């Protein structure tokens, strides 16, 4: 069996979240957490909570062994975009996409 956790509609552009989620995909959960701890990105602490939720879910809902867990899947999906405007020169207003992310992490026993 395998445990899932998702952080839906996180304010954090998917691109910025994917560049970090790519480091943990397939690692042991112990190592993965350390990688997130020493990877100085805005995505890191957000992805850590999802990954730690996945591990809690795997330990409490499915009695799996938290010492034998690898991150099986980890992906970031696009959430709904907040549309904003930045006033530019000559009265013109340029669009700003405040993008959101669905961060999913799946842990599996091995």
């Amino acid at each position: 069996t395998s445990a899932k956790a998702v952080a839906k509609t996180v304010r954090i552009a998917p691109r910025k979240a994917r560049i970090v989620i790519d480091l943990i995909r397939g690692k042991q959960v112990g190592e993965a957490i350390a990688i997130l701890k020493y990877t100085p990105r805005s995505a890191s602490p957000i992805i850590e909570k999802v990954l730690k939720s996945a591990i809690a879910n795997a330990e409490h809902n499915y009695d799996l062994d938290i010492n034998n867990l690898v991150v099986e899947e980890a992906f970031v999906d696009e959430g709904p975009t907040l549309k904003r405007f930045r006033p530019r020169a000559q009265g013109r207003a340029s669009a700003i996409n405040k993008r959101t992310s669905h961060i999913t992490v799946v842990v599996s026993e091995v």
Binding site: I19, V20, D22, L23, G30, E31, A34, I35, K37, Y38, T39, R41
Partner: protein
């Protein structure tokens, strides 16, 4: 000045081959038994590896 053609998906993906993070340079401690950056103080033990601070 401006893009003559839109960049294709394949081409955009090829440009990003290199836009990526490197794994942190970290190892397990002796005292802590936990991960840490080499040449940094380990905050789990609350010291520099085994050397107390």
């Amino acid at each position: 000045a401006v893009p003559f053609r839109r960049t294709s998906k394949a081409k955009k993906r090829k440009r990003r081959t290199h836009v990526k993070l490197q794994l942190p340079g970290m190892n397990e401690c002796s005292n802590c038994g936990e991960y840490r950056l080499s040449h940094h103080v380990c905050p789990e033990c609350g010291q520099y590896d085994g050397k107390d601070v």
